[PDB]
Amino acid sequence: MFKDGSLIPYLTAGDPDKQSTLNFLLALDEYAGAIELGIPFSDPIADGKTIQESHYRALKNGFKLREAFWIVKEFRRHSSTPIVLMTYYNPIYRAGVRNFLAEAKASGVDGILVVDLPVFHAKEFTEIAREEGIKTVFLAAPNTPDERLKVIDDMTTGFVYLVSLYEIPKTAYDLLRRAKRICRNKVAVGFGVSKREHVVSLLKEGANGVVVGSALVKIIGEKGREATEFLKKKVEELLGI
16 A cells, blocks of 8 residues: 555654644654654563564553544645554454444544454454555564464555564565465565664565564654754664665
8 A cells, every 4th residue: 555665664653742643743744655653552472672662651641542533633734645553452352343444433543453452353343444445564573473464464455564583684584485475465674673784684585564662662662742854864874864
């Protein structure tokens, strides 16, 4: 759902606050092919340390679920860049899948990624997502077998997101190689990129898109509301401008 060779920033909603998040998005938009906006959760057990700490900051500063929809709505007033909402199942489940997907679509969200979606709910979920007009994004880690990658690809309408278990490990490159051999959908990778050579290498190996999350959120946790300029400089470095 994004142009080939795209850089895809990931940011946690409400880190440090909802207004700063919006400011960050508007500043990175000109370099982004797509954007992943993460919804804070008290137990981000599938994320690395840097991202977990961002969820904690956002929640500590008093983030509210609906504020995520506010961010996207406001962003939609200035841009059409594809937005993928990333979230754990508890929030959506506790609010009602249909209700959630509907309001998400209403706000301007294009796709959704449910990190810990129970496998025996995937079918139902994909059904409703389609009905509500929301594209699905599913993730695959290095221990995902070829057979499962195929199933995931068949249920995916947005893109397949490849992530690392927790510079770039050979196991991550292996996952990408295998994925490009199986998936008809475009693939984006979130392998913990931090330098220009990472982006060059991953694109050369077939990644349609490269997500940049921890490298950006680390700056935010350090500069807070004043991270804007440093975020642009980091993306610029990764783009090799």
